[PDB]
Design a binder for this molecule. Structure first.
Ligand SMILES: N=C(N)Nc1ccc(Cl)c([C@@H](CS)C(=O)O)c1
Ligand SMILES: [Zn+2]
Length: 305
């Protein structure tokens, strides 16, 4: 149960960590719960930044999908990085002074616990579905963005099940609610996933392109270029629909349609050699290079407020 930044941590440890890291940095972090999961776990949210009046914000979540362990690891890495370098590294110092980072460590807590106890490859939530033994909804197919029109299954037995309705899951309803309640400050939305090594932006529910797609393409291009500087890791980027494939009900498209102009889905290491079972030996190299892209994007957004 002891926490480590170079190891995958179970929920009990991550929860204890959210409490301790907040206790150790009261001037930089405040913890809050934005909802409760289907099984009663608390969906924590860390507000990282120097407190001040009416600051803009960047929202970043991890752990949408249970099996994507590197995602959960990154949110934790990001927070230590933030508090450890504030006051010493100019860029991070300026970010924390000017804006707040809303870090959601693990969204799909129930599914994450399940990967630790019964099925390492679980993806969905763990809610029950009427008229069947099949469990869970794909949280990334449960948002009100062309809900369940494509790339999503209507069968609860499938891994991409869209749900009984948009925001049917307490997790996604809690996330949508928080965001809806803070639209005035949230300038960018970053949702962390694995694996594939990619940076995607809207849209996925449709082949139509976002108004600022050229700006988003330049941004994604610059960010993957910055990420490659550390270890040479190659990322690709583009609109979801054409780069990956059409998939409705994603949070990146939803957030964008709420007015959040900078919205990205990150696909972390690797390309498939280890896939979802990325070795703990790769946690630091992955989080470090990923830090470069996130910080690049943060500086861009700040310069365009
Ligand atoms: N709205 C979307 N479908 N966004 C989106 C973009 C790229 C990728 Cl890789 C995904 C994956 C993440 S596992 C997924 O949820 O299937 C979703
Ligand atoms: Zn995912």
């Amino acid at each position: 149960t002891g926490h480590s930044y170079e190891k995958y941590n179970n929920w009990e440890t991550i929860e204890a960590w959210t409490k301790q890291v907040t206790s150790e940095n009261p001037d930089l972090i405040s913890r809050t719960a934005i909802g409760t999961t289907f099984l009663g776990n608390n969906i924590y949210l860390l507000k990282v930044g120097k407190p001040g009046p009416n600051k803009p914000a960047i929202f970043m979540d991890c752990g949408f999908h249970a099996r994507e362990w590197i995602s959960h690891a990154f949110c934790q890495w990001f927070v230590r990085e933030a508090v450890l370098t504030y006051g010493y590294e100019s860029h991070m110092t300026e970010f924390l002074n000017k804006l707040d980072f809303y870090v959601l460590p693990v969204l799909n807590i129930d599914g994450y616990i399940y990967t630790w106890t019964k099925n390492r490859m679980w993806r969905k939530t763990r809610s029950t579905n009427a008229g069947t033994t099949c469990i869970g909804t794909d949280p990334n197919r449960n948002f009100d963005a062309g809900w369940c029109t494509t790339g999503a299954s209507t069968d609860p037995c499938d891994e991409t099940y869209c749900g009984s309705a948009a925001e049917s899951e307490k997790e996604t309803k809690a996330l949508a609610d928080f965001i809806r309640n803070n639209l005035s400050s949230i300038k960018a939305y970053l949702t962390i996933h694995s694996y594939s090594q990619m940076i995607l932006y809207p849209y996925s529910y449709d082949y139509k392109l976002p108004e600022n797609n050229a700006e988003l393409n330049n941004l994604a291009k610059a960010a993957v270029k910055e990420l490659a500087t550390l270890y040479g890791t190659k990322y690709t980027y583009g609109p979801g629909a054409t780069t990956i494939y059409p998939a409705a009900g994603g949070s990146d498209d939803w957030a964008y349609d709420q007015g959040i102009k900078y919205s990205f889905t990150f696909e972390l290491r690797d390309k498939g050699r280890y896939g979802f079972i990325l070795p703990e030996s790769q946690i630091q190299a992955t989080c470090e290079e990923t830090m470069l892209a996130i910080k690049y994007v943060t500086n861009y957004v700040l310069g365009h407020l």
